[PDB]
Design a protein around this ligand. Structure first.
Ligand SMILES: [Mg+2]
Ligand SMILES: [Mg+2]
Ligand SMILES: [Mg+2]
Ligand SMILES: [Mg+2]
Ligand SMILES: [Mg+2]
Ligand SMILES: [Mg+2]
Ligand SMILES: [Mg+2]
Ligand SMILES: [Zn+2]
Ligand SMILES: [Zn+2]
Lengths: 190, 55, 292, 117, 49, 169, 77, 86
RNA sequence: ACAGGUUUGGUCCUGGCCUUUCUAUUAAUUCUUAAUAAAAUUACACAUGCAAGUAUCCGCGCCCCGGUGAGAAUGCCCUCCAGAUCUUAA
């Protein structure tokens, strides 16, 4: 591929018009299989390193076909013009490695406004828009919130009495541990 | 549930009466039930060891 | 008593200036196709099936509510300094109940700093889409709503699809909704593309925005070039409704002009391109009165 | 299935992914398995932070307070989620754990200060 | 005082009914008396009334 | 289908398009009609067409037909309270019987709306589980949350093996 | 798990549980915080029981249920 | 197969021929176009004002294969296979 | 089923078999690394290790989780629920 920057420059070239013309790139491609019904899963990957797997796919046999989200003229060939659904792999004939990339590039071109698709008319989210409810509006702050005290009086750490400390130290003899004062208000960083 | 070919299980109901008779006839008396080996802190009846905080 | 968008005195003008184009409203979309059905109808049964389609096209042309930008939610319910650094991330809690509206849901966030505050507007609708999803909405912001993709969609003349996508994605009282709805209205009149929103459900939105921004110059001449005088006289009437204190509203009252002269009054009082409006009016007069 | 006893309990059913937990806050019998039969699913808890750095916790308060008034027991992480949401008071275990973390920080700052000299 | 979210639930519940009362909601503690763990529990059969 | 005179009445659409839902009191419907005379033509066409449509939407209501017993066709509804609702049909057409029965003992549109609106409440959108009862199985598939490691592999810093390898040294 | 008929292990036969160390100035504040928390959750439980009582009595014999229980029979007659 | 295909394809009834033999407007109701009554063939000549007899129950010769395909009882593994293009 | 091969010197009809599609186990040949899911011959017999503990004694739990598909045409769905358990005065 000489372009390598603009994939659409090959679709409008003369080498595309004398090779494919007004027909899709997969019109003349015929997939060989074992019977009258082809396998539901196409070839996984037809380009393994530098060797081509025999009869290549429509996209893969011509290396100047770049699967990109910019060239919509190549991506519209794999999307139905009437139903707007993407053709499966056994329909066109591309290997699965390129079919997955085609679906990804079609989605990347659809969320960029480059490819047309259905945009339904969706009713608004809510029936009535009332910002007067207390869920979205401000609520009257608590008396402890306007003062700066914790929500419950037992949230803060209160120093226990020495009589209760000794009552615990008498019953839990032998299993004692080192005492710890009030924890710091702000925890320092590393 | 309720089926026409259910079998009249009599042994299962006889064993309930036997176990209910044994519960009151061989009811262990509380004297040997709450006995205690003060050296190993082990109940001679059930075979459980007392917690460490009760020694 | 300010004129609101839900008033019948403005809805009766907007519905009349929207117009009924069945071939545009009931247009074959890009969905799955099915074999159509056929039945033999007489002339009266055909007219009945047509008026049924008109009364269905009314619900198709139901106007979306245009609202003012909502106030940012800044409220703190509790502050627990004990949890200043116990966690790195913030916990988002959502009240889920089928029987309560989405405007009354409690969406709170416990920050890692320890404050239990209410979730912002950008988070409330995101969590509401997370736990009550609707077709057409995305969790993250779609890339298509960027200005370059918007420029590409405006160059492909897909403004109706941009609008039907923005109404589906965002809430009518949000900020990005008003932003994109105004950015598309800044382009459709810059390029004179009012013909795209002719028979869509978005004509009245751009009309009610153009009358609020006093940008009527091209919208008048397009309705004059489209041989539509009954739409322009009602557009100037709705301008006089919206701006009661003004020389254009008072000159028509003091003169007692007809619908055909209500356009000239605005074209002489407060028209920016009044010469172009008057040239279009002369060219419509000298082309209609001779031919018909 | 038929049980001899048990009680209704609001707990977290670890129905999720490998190296990616996801809890379903459901009200089930205490003799039922973790991911087994339940009575009614209340909410869902995502322990991992999303792209916005938020741990999504979802509570059906209208059924939670109903089952609590009907006699449903609560577990420690469920009470922790309720205390972090503010529907229930903060748990004394969360308070003491935060105090212990603060004391660990207060020990590490003095160790890092006495190490430099 | 109620927990913050539950208190805001009442502050938004009574507001929608047209109640302009800004009184602070309180939680009762009369029927919430609990005996300590040292209180011995009865062993007699409880009679269903 | 192909066998029968009117094969259309043996399809799910014809059985589902019949909008006749009895009340919770209706238990038995005894239809008594004749097989001769030009009068009972409407009752014969009712038994031929609408009886399956009523029996499809009322599976618990017993329906019993009696032929050539009384000279005048009629219906007889036996309710739960013991009241017997006698309906005379001598020259009524097929549709008039349906509309008269839906008028005397049926369910209004307002009554039929609230039952399905309450049935809709059972399937909650915010719930998770199998595809049969809920809309989402693995929370991974939410667009914002962490992807599903069966599809996108997790980074190295988040796996338990790497965590237990850092905890080892 | 094991069964009531499964004998205990030989290495667990002569093993008793060992209590951990106790910090008294932390244990006291933890016990008092436990009591102050359980009293509040008990009050909330009683309040929720009262809400369930109100909803059940309403859905059984409310001023809205009696209206329908009368008008249904009126329209029936 | 060829003789029957050509016979059935030659014995078709055009929409114009239907509107001529019924003296009624043949209106096409497309699904994706909503309730829009598209008219495909106009009954040239005397347009009869008498509506056709609206039969409440159509006595059409249904086929069990199409009834099965409409009711979704077609569980065959060869019906929904992915095949090549035309 | 969008079907195809096959009876006969040959044609038509009836009619069976097989092929083409997808999945699971085993076998043969071949084989590089990761992530996820699953591990499935046996109701034949088991060496050995672990799987029910907690607690100031009492007590409470101890096929509950987990395992299997032998028997049973067993059962699916639907009424009534004794009894057991959790909080309360009910
Ligand atoms: Mg797993
Ligand atoms: Mg032969
Ligand atoms: Mg093998
Ligand atoms: Mg014990
Ligand atoms: Mg099992
Ligand atoms: Mg047998
Ligand atoms: Mg019971
Ligand atoms: Zn290929
Ligand atoms: Zn997952």
């Amino acid at each position: 591929s000489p372009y390598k920057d603009e994939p659409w420059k090959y679709l409008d070239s003369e080498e595309y018009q004398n090779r494919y013309g007004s027909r899709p790139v997969w019109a003349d491609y015929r997939r060989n299989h074992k019977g009258g019904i082809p396998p539901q899963r196409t070839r996984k990957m037809c380009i393994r390193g530098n060797k081509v797997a025999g009869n290549p796919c429509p996209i893969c046999r011509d290396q100047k076909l770049h699967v990109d989200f910019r060239n919509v003229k190549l991506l519209e060939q794999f999307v139905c013009a009437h139903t707007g659904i993407i053709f499966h792999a056994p329909y066109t004939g591309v290997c699965m490695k390129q079919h997955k990339k085609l679906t990804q590039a079609i989605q990347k071109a659809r969320d960029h406004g480059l490819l047309r698709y259905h945009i339904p008319q969706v009713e608004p989210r809510d029936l009535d828009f009332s910002t007067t409810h207390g869920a979205v509006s401000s609520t009257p702050p608590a008396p402890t919130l306007v003062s700066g005290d914790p929500w419950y009086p037992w949230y803060s750490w209160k120093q226990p009495p020495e009589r209760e400390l000794s009552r615990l130290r008498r019953l839990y003899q032998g299993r004692l541990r080192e005492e710890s004062g009030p924890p710091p208000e702000l925890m320092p960083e590393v | 549930m309720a089926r026409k070919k259910v079998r009249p299980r009599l042994i299962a109901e006889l064993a309930r009466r036997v176990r209910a008779l044994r519960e009151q006839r061989e009811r262990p008396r509380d004297s040997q039930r709450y006995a205690l080996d003060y050296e190993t802190m082990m109940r001679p009846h059930s075979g459980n060891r007392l917690p460490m905080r009760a020694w | 008593r300010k004129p609101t968008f839900m008033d019948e005195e403005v809805q009766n003008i907007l519905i009349k200036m929207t117009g009924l184009d069945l071939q545009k409203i009931f247009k074959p979309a890009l969905q799955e196709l099915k074999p159509p059905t056929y039945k033999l109808m007489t002339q009266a049964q055909l007219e009945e099936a047509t008026k049924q389609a008109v009364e269905a096209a009314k619900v198709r042309l139901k106007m979306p509510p245009v609202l003012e930008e909502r106030a940012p939610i800044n409220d703190v319910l509790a502050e627990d300094k004990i949890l200043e650094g116990t966690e790195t991330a913030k916990y988002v809690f959502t009240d889920i109940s089928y029987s309560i509206p989405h405007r009354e849901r409690f969406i709170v966030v416990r920050e890692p700093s320890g404050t239990l505050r209410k979730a912002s507007w950008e988070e409330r609708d995101r969590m509401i889409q997370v736990y009550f999803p609707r077709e057409g909405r995305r969790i993250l912001t779609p890339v298509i709503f960027k200005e370059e993709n918007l420029q590409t969609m405006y160059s492909q003349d897909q403004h109706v699809d941009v609008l039907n996508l923005c109404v589906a994605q965002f809430e009518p009282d949000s900020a990005e909704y008003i932003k994109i709805h105004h950015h598309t209205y800044e382009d459709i009149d810059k390029c004179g593309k009012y013909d795209l929103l002719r028979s869509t459900r978005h004509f009245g939105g751009m009309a009610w925005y153009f009358v609020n921004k006093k940008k009527i110059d091209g919208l008048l001449i397009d309705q004059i070039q489209r041989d539509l005088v009954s739409d322009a006289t009602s557009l100037v009437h709705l301008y006089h409704i919206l701006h009661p204190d003004g020389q254009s509203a008072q000159e028509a009252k003091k003169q007692g002009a007809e619908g055909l002269h209500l356009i000239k009054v605005f074209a002489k009082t407060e028209a920016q391109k009044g010469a172009y409006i008057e040239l279009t009016l002369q060219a419509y007069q000298e082309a209609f009165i001779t031919h018909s | 299935r038929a049980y001899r006893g048990g009680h209704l309990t609001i707990r977290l059913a670890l129905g999720g992914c490998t190296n990616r937990p996801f809890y379903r806050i459901v009200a089930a019998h205490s003799k039922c398995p973790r991911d087994g039969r339940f009575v009614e699913q209340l909410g869902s808890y995502d322990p991992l932070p999303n792209s916005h750095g938020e741990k999504l916790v979802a509570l059906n308060f209208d059924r939670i307070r109903h089952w609590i008034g009907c006699g449903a027991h609560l577990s420690k992480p469920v009470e922790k989620l309720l205390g972090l949401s503010g529907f229930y008071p903060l748990h004394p275990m969360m308070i003491t754990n935060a105090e212990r973390l603060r004391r660990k920080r207060a020990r590490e700052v003095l160790l890092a200060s006495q190490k430099t000299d | 005082p109620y927990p913050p979210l539950l208190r805001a639930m009442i502050l938004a519940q009574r507001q929608k009914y047209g109640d302009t009362s800004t009184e602070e909601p309180m939680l009762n503690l009369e029927r919430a008396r609990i005996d300590p763990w040292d209180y011995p529990a009865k062993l007699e059969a409880k009679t269903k009334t | 289908p192909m066998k029968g005179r009117f094969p259309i009445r043996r399809t799910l659409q014809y059985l589902g398009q019949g909008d006749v839902v009895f009340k919770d009191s209706v238990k038995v419907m005894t239809v008594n009609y004749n097989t001769h005379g030009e009068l009972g033509e409407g009752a014969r066409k009712f038994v031929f067409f609408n009886i399956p449509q009523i029996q499809y939407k009322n599976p618990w209501v017993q329906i019993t037909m009696f032929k050539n017993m009384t000279p005048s066709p009629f219906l007889r509804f036996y309710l739960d309270s013991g009241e017997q609702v006698l309906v005379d049909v001598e020259s009524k057409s097929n549709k008039e019987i349906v509309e008269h029965i839906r008028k005397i003992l049926g369910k209004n549109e307002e009554t039929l709306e609230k039952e399905e609106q309450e049935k809709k409440q059972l399937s909650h959108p915010a719930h998770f589980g199998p595809r049969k009862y809920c809309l989402r199985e693995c929370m991974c598939e939410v667009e914002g949350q962490v992807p599903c490691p069966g599809l996108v592999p997790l980074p190295k810093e988040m796996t338990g093996k790497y965590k237990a390898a850092l905890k080892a040294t | 798990r094991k069964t009531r008929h499964d004998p205990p292990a030989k290495s667990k036969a002569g093993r008793v549980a060992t209590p951990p160390a106790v910090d008294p100035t932390e244990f006291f504040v933890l016990t008092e915080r436990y009591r102050q928390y359980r009293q509040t959750v008990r009050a909330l439980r009683l309040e929720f029981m009262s809400e369930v009582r109100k909803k059940l009595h309403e859905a059984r014999a409310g001023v809205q249920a009696e209206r329908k229980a009368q008008e249904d029979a009126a329209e029936h007659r | 197969l060829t003789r029957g295909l050509f016979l059935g394809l030659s014995r078709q009834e055009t929409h114009q021929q239907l509107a001529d033999k019924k003296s009624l407007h043949v209106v096409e109701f497309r699904e994706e176009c909503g309730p829009l009554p598209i008219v495909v063939a106009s009954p040239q000549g005397a347009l009869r004002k008498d509506p056709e007899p609206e039969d409440e129950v159509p006595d059409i010769t249904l086929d069990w294969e199409d009834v099965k395909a409409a009711q979704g009882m077609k569980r065959s593994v060869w019906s929904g296979l992915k095949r090549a293009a035309t």
